[PDB]
Amino acid sequence: RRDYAQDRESIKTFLSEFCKCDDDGKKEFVYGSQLVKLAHREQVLITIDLDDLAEFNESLAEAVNCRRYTSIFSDVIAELLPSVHAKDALDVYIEHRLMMEFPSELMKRFEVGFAHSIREVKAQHIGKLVTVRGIVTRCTEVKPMMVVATYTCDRCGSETYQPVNSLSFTPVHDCPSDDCRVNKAGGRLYLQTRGSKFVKFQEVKMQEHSDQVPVGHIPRSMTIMCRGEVTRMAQPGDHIVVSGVFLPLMRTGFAQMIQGLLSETFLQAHRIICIPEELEELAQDDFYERLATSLAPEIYGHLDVKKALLLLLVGGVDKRPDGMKIRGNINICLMGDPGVAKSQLLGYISRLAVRSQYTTGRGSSGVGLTAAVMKDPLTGEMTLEGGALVLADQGVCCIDEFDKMADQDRTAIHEVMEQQTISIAKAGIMTTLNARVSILAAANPAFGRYNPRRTVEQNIQLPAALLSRFDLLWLIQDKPDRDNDLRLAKHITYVHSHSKQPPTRVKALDMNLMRRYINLCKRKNPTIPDELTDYIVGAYVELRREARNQKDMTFTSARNLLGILRLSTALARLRLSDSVEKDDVAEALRLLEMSKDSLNQ
Template sequence: MAPKDYLAEKEKCKRFLQEFYSEDDSGKKVFKYGAQLVALAHREQVGLVVDLDDVAEEDPELVESVCENTKRYTVLFADAVHELLPEYREREVVAKDALDVYIEHRLMMETRGRDPADMRDPRNQYPAELMRRFEVYFRPPSTSKPKVVRDVKADSIGKLVTVRGIVTRATEVKPMMAVATYTCDQCGAETYQPIASPSFMPLIMCPSQECVTNRSGGRLYLQTRGSKFVKFQELRIQEHSDQVPVGNIPRSMTIYARGENTRLVQPGDHVAVSGVFLPLLRSGFRQAVQGLLSETYLEAHCVTLMNKTEDDELGTEDLSEEELRQITEEDFYEKLAGSIAPEIYGHEDVKKALLLLLVGGVEQAPRGMKIRGNINICLMGDPGVAKSQLLSYIDRLAPRSQYTTGRGSSGVGLTAAVMRDPVTGEMTLEGGALVLADLGVCCIDEFDKMADADRTAIHEVMEQQTISIAKAGIMTSLNARCSILAAANPAYGRYNPRKTIEQNIQLPAALLSRFDLLWLIQDKPDTDNDLRLAQHITYVHQHSKQPPTHFTPIDMKLMRRYLSKCKKRQPVVPEALADYITAAYVEMRKEARVSKDTTFTSARTLLSILRLSTALARLRMVDVVEKEDVNEAMRLMEMSKDSLQRRRRWSRLRPRLPRLSRLLRNTQSRTTVTRTTRTTPPTTSQSCMTLTATPTPPPTPTNKHHKYTTPTNTQHQPIYNTDKYTTPTNTQH
């Protein structure tokens, strides 16, 4: 391979900057880079971004050369811009800073001290970095594919690569010296030292010809006003959780951001960084200790914030007719819920609640306060009821998620840690699991095994959606706008019906009230249900897929795309439903007081109903919440309360019966129970009373999307005389 003529390559760069143009709608030529050169000449712009897609239209070979040897071509483009700037300067720069004045004074003093007939010594040229007031960056071509952090290896040294990850650490922006300027105390000569490494050895003795000839031994002193500084920030990115192979720890990469690429991201942001992969060159004793091994970093050229992952970005495309047909069927609500972990048997209402968690409610921001829209759910139950499997599936389904366990997580690991930066020696923030799950879902397994001191760290996150830090002189607030899905076991391993709810759960009320739904999943022996569960498990074990059902589960990618479209909706609650929701909440509070309910019905319960209702409206892709959405939200909340109170109730989608009617029914129920107990002999067949009650059918929907079906009793268990809304009938006559 013949060596490249870099002078000819620089002419190519100069010709591209001058001649490249595009046509607008009217057919007029627009010189894209010519306008940027004018802005650079007038100090209206600092960074010149060269899009390699534009270069590919003119010279594809030049694009390949830039991607293979990015560092050298950055210098070539910078030289070309520096030579072209005087041609594009239309007026003098009005706003001059201290460095401009310093350079002009330096040139004037040099001109006075030199004979006009003498030529300037080429060795006395000013460094290019000192005179240039612009920065050159490359934007990678659209045909290049981003790499995983663990795939960036030694063959990528010096090349333009793009990596994606999540920012775990970001240092403060500091001035980094690019050119050090010294002044001699004897002869007054200036000496310049370009710096290309993180550390350097300052010059001490003056190398000027006058000091060497006179042997005066002049000493150099650093002139900070005459030196060139650039903004510098160090970032640390970590690969996404779905890119980590099983059994491996996530890989990280150091990013050096300079100039205009600083202050663009913070911990918890998902970014795509394009830059040059380079080895970190040490100097002095540190290089000798380092030996043959070298640390690496990525010199950032283009930093792009990614609010969505690649799969989530697919949601911007329109759904096809076939995909719309799958989703817009009559039973779409049950179909979407059944597509969540179809390998797991049962748990229909739990899956519906998890579906609403993925969609989320509408966030409200009144003046002076903020009401969260994310839904928090806690699954508590006996061992072996597939709590962890549900969490694992939600972790894979959610576009942005973090999975952790209670015993393996500390309060600092969940929120944020204060670390000492090895470069500057200052304290920096490193985001925890909740910060990294911003705008996503944080799944916490074994929630009950977490220490109380660590568990209190998430109280602020669950309600205010922020993490306030006041450590080591750092006082800030990080965003943690995530939904929390927790799984826990009862205090005694299994739920003990002989003990109260507080004794079984043993979680503080301040934490329980922050969960919108607290679901208790019990493993009760039942012959029919156990038979169906065993057949389901054996089929999955034998065929490695879920058993055939009456519908085909929706693909995970299609669900992501549909849910991403649902999240764009901002439904509102109409005034007509305000009284209905208020009356329902007052009735829930009254019932909780009468029955000594211990599920913490508070004002947060009302907000939970609103969040679930708006999530259901989002799921139907409408902008107004309807009465059926409120009824379904109340049904889910009632089912979660029933699971905790160990009593079966028929879910009612109509307003509560008047208090007088309930009192009459309760009185009649107690009279019938007493009379039956006295007259009926204690036989085994009569130990269970048969209840004849017909649940009120749901209101007739106006749209096929409005159908929310009430699940029947899938456990096939006898219904005991514990329902306060039904009247037992004496079957003995």
């Protein structure tokens, strides 16, 4: 009904009259800048958004089908060359075909792209470009996709054009050529990859958020086919939001399994959005301790545990001597059953700590948290399909009540104590998998709540092999204190009468600001001046004497010294001064001492 032509005039006016002076800084040509970026042979994809055309008019806020507009604008600016020879493979290869002498898509050279979920996705959504957020599933890989090949006749010579949109196809035969027409001189048909056009191609399933799905519902997935430039633009288990099109899928073939008008739909892509800049404001603030003041406000007091965590948040200790690496990840252990809200801090960290994970005391047996295997006589063979502990690299996978899972379960996790090494002689390998995950252990005491008669490993039943792999072991008990629980109570009830706990003692730090300030930290690689080396080796001995002077005491591993070394240089990442010094390790030992000497007194 509407004209698909006079709109071409409208958009010519739009892009031509485009230096839109709404602010100091727009009299220059915006899409002229992008135009010349095409003339730079650089940009192969431009972009449309609601604001852009919204100011222009109000038709096309509901006209744009999303399909005809694209081919029209593409051909429109393809024939727009207001503007150098050897820039591309194919681009110069046409000149090679012209050295002795098309649709503008075959010289593609560029592209353009432009508050609901699958559940709400009402089935009158065809063609409309809509918005949904999900979770990625079943990570796959990318291959080339033809669009239009060049089936030359050789004897005749006529590089045939087979521009295709389908996903299945059929060959082109000997010759639809002019000289290979009724004029008897002809050869045969045969493509030339070099002059052919293909396109990247990434696909993966999309599962539901799991926060919307009603009481009587089961999450389901859709399919994602993103081709061309945008490939490799999301990993598995990223909570991502996509604007694209719903489009049906003409699954042609058999004439009785189809022929229902089957309509097994699918989706077309534009983008994978997943829900220094700070430097001037980072200049506004210079403090070390306020992180604890604004990280996890939900409980008053017990800062020491939190700062112990924030160190693991800090990081920044690693070296590769002798060819071999060193574990630069901290792994805390946790015993206790008070009301701590380990579940609290776990949820807090797992939210703010990007690339987080969670498992429970029996939810993942030894094969699930790591890679595993499967069985099916319908899809082919089976793979490892690693688990949370496999996936949580550059981060932490947080087990809750590792004490209660199982004794043999300590094995495979103990294997990852020596980091980045997940050996598997199961699928005919000694595979590695790079287990590069910081580890969070939290459990409860044994029968009772730290019965003072039943001593350590008298009350506990854990082999030394795992405690040795753990930098810090922490028992948490707070006996009846008349004054203690008061403050904690009124503190809790504050966000019950209210929504935001801590007033007027610090500036709260949002997830964004917190993460960004932490983002500026770890790349210092600071200086530990040489006097420490003689000094610290002395101080370590101070431990090893008061370890031996009582005979019913803890054993020690070389990691005790390696740990007390490992922690200090990390914290200088958040000092941001490349200056590992006395305080850098005096806090290390201080917190180590606080880890102990707490259960007798």
